[PDB]
Structure 1
Amino acid sequence: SSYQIAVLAGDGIGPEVMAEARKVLKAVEARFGLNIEYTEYDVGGIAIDNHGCPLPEATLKGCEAADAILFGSVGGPKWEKLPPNEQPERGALLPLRGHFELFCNLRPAKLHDGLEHMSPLRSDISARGFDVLCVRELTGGIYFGKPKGRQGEGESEEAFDTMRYSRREISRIARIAFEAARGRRKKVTSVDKANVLACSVLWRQVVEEVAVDFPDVELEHIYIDNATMQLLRRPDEFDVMLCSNLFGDILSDEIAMLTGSMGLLSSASMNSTGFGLFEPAGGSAPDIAGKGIANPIAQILSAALMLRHSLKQEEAASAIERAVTKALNSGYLTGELLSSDQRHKAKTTVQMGDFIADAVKAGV
């Protein structure tokens, strides 16, 4: 019957861009005959304000009742004095990932044609282009490893976190990266610190075990400090980057920033049953919230990931992706995608949503 989506728009620009994601989703529901019901739940800063914590029980319950979470962005100044550890971002995202076993984070980042000038890369490097998919392991490693805590007092007070990975955890994320490379340019670069970390020694070992099932995919390994340098220099040489939790956190963000267009980038965090949480790569931009300035493309393309990965609605997902493409090549750019002197052509959040939804309707 009807798919059920828990909508967790969160803070800042989350609600206004989500409104555009929902608009485009309505055009897709009509075009493809999907029956999707949505329920909205507070999360993040709005949840602390409304319910006293960033992830209320009723929100958590609504995500359990759903086929996917369509997630906005969480965080901002108002809760920044809370300890970084009662704070809304980690307090929303980490238990959602842990609870639903969302072990796989997919962050596709590409330099779009015509938007190279916006990348912070030197012009000859951005002109080459890139398209890197970061596959990051999201539920193990040092984020969730135990023991974590502190003991002692005074100078000798000590804090500890444990990075742990099992062969099973590593091989499930590696297979995702290999399967994804098969569909792309047939290369996985696995990113670790095997010269220092026991977890990375096992990581590199297990990814090489997984590789035997993918004779058509090239595998290379690289150290995280070297990967961060090489992305600056030659990001066009990477296809799929495969990382543990902490390394993928850093590298996916680095690659996103190298596009210079984070308002175009979306993220899927999924479990093995196909449930996921789909969100823009960027933050809640509380400075521009409520102004019709924010670029809703990242949230619209998060809707498209949700349709593909959780709802198994490939044609609907790709129709949204084509409508975004059409916007970007038909002069429908928001302010942050425009060179400072073309800024007077900017479209508002609503104009972008209207255009992209209308494109879907026109059969793009």
Structure 2
Amino acid sequence: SSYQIAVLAGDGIGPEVMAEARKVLKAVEARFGLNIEYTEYDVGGIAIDNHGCPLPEATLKGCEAADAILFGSVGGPKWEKLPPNEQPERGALLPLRGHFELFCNLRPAKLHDGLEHMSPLRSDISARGFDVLCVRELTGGIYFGKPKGRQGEGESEEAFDTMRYSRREISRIARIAFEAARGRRKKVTSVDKANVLACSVLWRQVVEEVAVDFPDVELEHIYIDNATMQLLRRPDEFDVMLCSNLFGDILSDEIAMLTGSMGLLSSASMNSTGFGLFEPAGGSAPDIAGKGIANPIAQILSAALMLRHSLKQEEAASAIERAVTKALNSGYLTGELLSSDQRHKAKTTVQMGDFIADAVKAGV
């Protein structure tokens, strides 16, 4: 019936961009007759300010009462002297993922036509283009493995983290990657360090076991140091990249930055029942906050991921995506998408959201 969304806009540009996502959602709600109710909750640094911790009890409970979390961004210089476990970004995101079992992170990164010049890639590499989905295991591996901590004092004081995966954890993230490849270009590149790590040995072994169910999908394996090199040089050769938690973290940010256009990229972190956490791929960009400069496209597109993946509102999700395409091909781009001689054509955050929501209303 009537969906419930926990809106966790966080810090920096999170609120001003979330305002545009919500604006575009309003247009989609009216066009498709969706009944979505939203409640806002403090998270990250504003929650520390307001409630003394990055993930208040009340915010968590709001997320459990929701069908999805629409999440902005967290962190900023203000909290960047806090002891590393009280800090906003890890203190909002890791417990969210752990509590809701959001084991699947999807971060698709593509080079958009006309924006090749912005890619830090050499012009003939960006001109080939790319389109790489990183599928990253989000609730296991070295992030949540135990023992973690430290023992001892002085020179022999040591600290430790345990990277741990079971067959079950690996197979459920691998199926996600194969299924995604199946509807893309039918190739999974599994990324590990199987020459060094026992988790990676089992990782590679299991993802190969999952492959039997996808005889139309090509699987190759690559070590993470090789994957990071190869993506800099021929990112067009990857379709779906399938990674454990630490590796996926590194790789997803790497190809996102290779696009040159992070303010266009969004993220889905989902559990097996369709609940998920939907967010822009970039940070809270505190330096540009409250200035009407941030690109809201990433947050807008996060709301379209939320519609699709949690609310099963595929039409609505697709309408927002095309209203974004339309912006991008009708000269509605924020300042960071424009070369320095074109930076005077920059639209503000409000202008971007206004356009994109008008487009949805107009039947794009």
Structure 2 counterpart SS, 1:292: coil
CA drift at 1:84: 2.3
Structure 1 counterpart SS, 2:143: coil
Cα distance in 2 for residues equivalent to 1:197 and 1:326: 46
Q: Deviations over 1:213-268 (max 9, x none)?
A: 00000000000000000000000000000000000000000000000000000000
What is the TM-score of this pair, normalised by structure 1? 1.00
Q: Deviations over 1:124-171 (max 9, x none)?
A: 000000000000000000000000000000000000000000000000
Consecutive aligned runs of 4 or more in structure 1 exceeding 6 Å deviation: none
| Superposition pairs of residues 1-364 of structure 1, within 5 angstroms | 1-364=1-364
Cα distance in 2 for residues equivalent to 1:209 and 1:286: 44
Cα distance in 1 for residues equivalent to 2:222 and 2:151: 35
Cα distance in 2 for residues equivalent to 1:158 and 1:283: 31
Cα distance in 2 for residues equivalent to 1:10 and 1:84: 18
Cα distance in 1 for residues equivalent to 2:58 and 2:43: 10
Cα distance in 2 for residues equivalent to 1:123 and 1:199: 38
Structure 1 counterpart SS, 2:59: helix
Cα distance in 2 for residues equivalent to 1:343 and 1:189: 37
CA drift at 1:118: 0.1
CA drift at 1:185: 0.1
Cα distance in 2 for residues equivalent to 1:342 and 1:302: 27
Cα distance in 1 for residues equivalent to 2:181 and 2:310: 20
Cα distance in 2 for residues equivalent to 1:33 and 1:182: 32
Cα distance in 2 for residues equivalent to 1:291 and 1:304: 25
Q: Which runs of 5+ in 2 are unaligned?
A: none
Cα distance in 2 for residues equivalent to 1:194 and 1:85: 30
Cα distance in 2 for residues equivalent to 1:104 and 1:83: 28
**How big is the alpha-carbon RMSD for the aligned residues of Structure 1 and Structure 2?**
0.3
Q: Which deviates the most, 80-89 or 57-66?
A: 80-89
CA drift at 1:184: 0.2
Q: Which deviates the most, 203-212 or 78-87?
A: 78-87
Structure 1 counterpart SS, 2:142: coil
CA drift at 1:83: 1.5
Q: Which deviates the most, 316-325 or 83-92?
A: 83-92
Cα distance in 2 for residues equivalent to 1:267 and 1:195: 30
Q: Deviations over 1:74-104 (max 9, x none)?
A: 0000000002221000000000000000000
Q: Deviations over 1:37-71 (max 9, x none)?
A: 00000000000000000000000000000000000
Q: Deviations over 1:261-295 (max 9, x none)?
A: 00000000000000000000000011000000000
Cα distance in 2 for residues equivalent to 1:86 and 1:270: 24
Q: Which runs of 5+ in 1 are unaligned?
A: none
Task: Report the number of matched residues.
Answer: 364
Cα distance in 2 for residues equivalent to 1:60 and 1:143: 20
Identity %: 100
